[PDB]
């Protein structure tokens, strides 16, 4: 693609500059270029990729919800057409990210920290497709399948305080609550995840403790809304 002529190291440096500049579309394009070099990503580089696309799809999701609300209130073709324009652009970002995960980030990810991170991302981008889907059942099952594989590996290979494992459980619990219409599964997963993390905190340094408790606070925030 357009980044084929730039050094991998230059694409990563420019991703970090684009982040500082709040240029998330540029950041995502630089990280897509880095992934297409074909080398595995480091932990820092995986996080750059995730932050870039999360910011991009986050803008699109926020816009889609504003337009969907207006469209529902309105029930001229303009509101539907513009909601459909934003929806298609969102689907294209999800398809781009799922494309990178399947070509070939997941298949070359052997360590638990890489493989769980990428399978969580695959679950998250299917979830974003599911949010706008009205094939919806098959998209939901794709999200569930990715999250379940990531959960199985995380429970065998990572301590319960591992921030990737915690973020996975957080996002899978929100999948259950509002995509799968399984609020009881969401609450059960959030509580078990919180309680098992609480009991492992004793093992951590000050810096790991801060990283784990930050995500545990998001589980608590959801449980407070759900109960």
């Amino acid at each position: 693609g357009a980044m084929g002529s730039m050094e991998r190291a230059s694409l990563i440096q420019k991703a970090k500059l684009a982040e500082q500049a709040e240029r998330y579309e540029d950041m995502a394009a630089f990280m897509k270029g880095a992934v297409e070099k074909g080398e595995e990503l480091s932990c820092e580089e995986r996080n750059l990729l995730s932050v870039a696309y999360k910011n991009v799809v986050g803008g699109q999701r926020a816009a889609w919800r504003v337009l969907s609300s207006i469209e529902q209130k309105s029930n001229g073709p303009e509101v539907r057409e513009y909601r459909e324009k934003v929806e298609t652009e969102l689907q294209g970002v999800c398809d781009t990210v799922l494309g990178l995960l399947d070509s070939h980030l997941i298949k070359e990810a052997g360590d638990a920290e890489s493989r769980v991170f990428y399978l969580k991302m695959k679950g998250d981008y299917y979830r974003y497709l599911a949010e706008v889907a009205t094939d919806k059942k098959r998209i939901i099952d794709s999200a569930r399948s990715a999250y379940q594989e990531a959960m199985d590996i995380s429970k065998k290979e990572m301590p319960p305080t591992n921030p990737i494992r915690l973020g996975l459980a957080l996002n899978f619990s929100v999948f259950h609550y509002e995509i799968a219409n399984s609020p009881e599964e969401a609450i059960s997963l959030a509580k078990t995840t919180f309680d098992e993390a609480m009991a492992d905190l004793h093992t951590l340094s000050e810096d790991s403790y801060k990283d784990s408790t930050l995500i545990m606070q998001l589980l608590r925030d959801n449980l407070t809304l759900w109960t």
Partner: peptide, 12 residues
């Protein structure tokens, strides 16, 4: 919509 608490940038 009430959005729940997912991991990473609260970008939406």
């Amino acid at each position: 919509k009430l959005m729940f608490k997912t991991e990473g940038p609260d970008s939406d």
